[PDB]
Amino acid sequence: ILQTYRAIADYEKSEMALSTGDVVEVVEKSESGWWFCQMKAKRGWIPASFLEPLDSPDETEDPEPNYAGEPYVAIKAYTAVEGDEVSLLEGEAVEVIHKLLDGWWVIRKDDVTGYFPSMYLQKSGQDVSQAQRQIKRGAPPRRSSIRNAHSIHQRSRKRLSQDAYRRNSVRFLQQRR
Known about the structure:
- The protein is 10% helix and 23% strand.
- By secondary structure, the protein is mostly beta strands.
- It folds into three domains: 1-41, Roll (SH3 type barrels); 68-123, SH3 type barrels (Roll); 124-177, no CATH class.
- The strands form two sheets. The chain has a five-stranded antiparallel sheet with strand order 7-6-5-4-8.
- A hairpin with a 5-residue loop joins strand 5 (93-98) and strand 6.
- The protein is elongated.
- The protein starts with a strand and ends in a 5-residue tail after the last helix.
- It is found in: Cytoplasm, Cytosol; Membrane.
């Protein structure tokens, strides 16, 4: 594949500067002495909440809400920090109504709606141990936990308030119980 080389000195700007010790992958060697290279890609898991799409403030792949609800149970206890969050003890049953991609799902419990970490929930009637081993990291931080976020979009991201979620929830819910 691509050969890996190392910079033995600093090179100033060639849209890429070089710092001694830098590791690069050589894409094209040339007898001209100028080689086209790329820095080792920097990858990793990050909280979706800290990101915003470039083209628009709104996420394009969030699934649609389902007010009918899906039965889930808390597999890990969580204490609400903000008013729009739901506190649950392990074993408490809830109904998921919006599986948002930022990890904080809207759930319904006792006629009211609020957010809860998806990672701490599992469909009812399944192996709890299995869902717990799937937890290899804590709940991601919420966007509302960010102080002084900076956006490139003047318009705010579209997201129903908990009151709006509740009004839809009480009207279009489905109980098989």
